[PDB]
């Protein structure tokens, strides 16, 4: 396979400035050009796109600019001899910093301070409220690249780190890995429980009223996975009842989070709008994978993040 | 000198529950007991206190529960042969985590998301706004115990760390140490400038309109030193002008920060109420010190944090 051209599908606009992404791909070796919705693709063509189009199967190579290609018919890709790659594995830094910020927010009480700032109010916290992350336990549920991002920053801040993954196999910076059938054991002693798994059949609704009952009443839940990993009504009830102290939520069962949701009005909930992975450099991070795989097509090495 | 007894001034209450403090002193070797705001103290008497009291000069040993000493008559403790210590060196964890939280707040935009939560509003940041700390420069001004706590967490989160101190000698986790006369050089390329120096003659007003001019316009000031290290009206002007982007301020020229201060109303300022060192275990931290120093009195070693 010899790559003549790189096409930037207009669908990348849903995650970044297409113009800025073309700039970041301008040192590739190959013409890069903004593709319309009316484009045929010959051999020699690489497409970079957000979502799927059927026209792409006449190209040599498609790179999905997302981690997730549930938009993309994997069988039909195999059929055409069209290579498919994705952008899995570049979100550990943004997401792990978001999560460390959530945790430091709760520990140091930044969110209450910000509420007070609205009201020009010098309100001192109660003695019992401020704590430090150093020595506290975090449980990270899911230990692929997202969770490892959380783990590394939690360990950097001196946290005791445990987690949950399917294999039960050790992971750098995690003291104890549990299998998913010991979820309750893993979360029982954690100050924070962080959700960082893909949404599957197996993970949908895994965090519900019984998990909130096992969790410590001073503990907080972080969701940076998908909304339906959590049973959202049970979260509301667990918050109302004091089964857990609070939550930081980046994802929800319906997004945008409807205005009438009770989740907005808990003091110890942080709502963020599906931005835990937002970065002003997303274009450079995707462009670096594109570049890596161009240089890999030219030496004959296999592609990073190959689906089919 | 043979220590019979430990007493606890009533106005340690102004920083911690003295009951919790007595618990944490109950593995000492020597009887522990609460003091009234008039008590007399013989030979073998140890007092722990917030502020100064003259009835305590009849005791052997006073431990200030603050980092500061400036509200103590340093001379007169000489005369009666009364040892004086403070609580310097125990704030690097709390303050370092508060600063990491400030920086993660600006980089991930949590403060703007929290303002949106008040309004039940799904407000995505602009593409250009969210960034990561990994790879960005922080300059820590003052590399004593406070600054080192900032340094270690910023280095662990992958930041490029430089700093300023008098000697200019190496400090662990700092790439470049500058002397105070190269302050402008030190802050010119920093995304965050962090103030962690004592207020002295030399440091009063060291950050003012010329320093805000030299600083990058996307940079933020953090102040966890004292308000008057900064010329507050020049900070306001620098914020109004866009000389810098924002600030996180824990300390002010007048505390409580008056209601009419314009610092409350900048979006990219975080006000916090002199709480960057708040911890619900402050009692355990000061307790630790007390125990170190009575064991040092009994084997004739020199006292930790001794002024007089
Ligand atoms: Mg194995
Ligand atoms: Mg269950
Ligand atoms: Mg409301
Ligand atoms: Mg100057
Ligand atoms: Mg206002
Ligand atoms: Na619970
Ligand atoms: Na400036």
From Swiss-Prot, chains A, B:
Keywords: NAD, NADP, Oxidoreductase. It is an enzyme of class 1 (oxidoreductase). SUPFAM superfamilies: NAD(P)-binding Rossmann-fold domains. NAD(+) binds at residues 145-146, 224-226, 250, 274-277. GO terms for biological process: carboxylic acid metabolic process. The keyword NADP applies. GO terms for molecular function: carboxylic acid binding; NADH binding; NADPH binding; oxidoreductase activity, acting on the CH-OH group of donors, NAD or NADP as acceptor. InterPro entries: D-isomer_DH_NAD-bd, Dhydh_Halo, NAD(P)-bd_dom_sf. The keyword Oxidoreductase applies. Its EC number is 1.1.1.-. Belongs to the D-isomer specific 2-hydroxyacid dehydrogenase family. Catalyzes the stereospecific NAD(P)H-dependent reduction of 2-ketocarboxylic acids into the corresponding D-2-hydroxycarboxylic acids. Can use both NADPH or NADH as reductant, displaying a marked preference for NADPH over NADH. Shows a broad substrate specificity, although it displays a marked preference for the 2-ketocarboxylic acids having an unbranched chain of 4-5 carbon atoms. Homotetramer. This is D-2-hydroxyacid dehydrogenase. It comes from Haloferax mediterranei (strain ATCC 33500 / DSM 1411 / JCM 8866 / NBRC 14739 / NCIMB 2177 / R-4). The lineage of its organism: Archaea, Methanobacteriati, Methanobacteriota, Stenosarchaea group, Halobacteria. The gene is ddh.
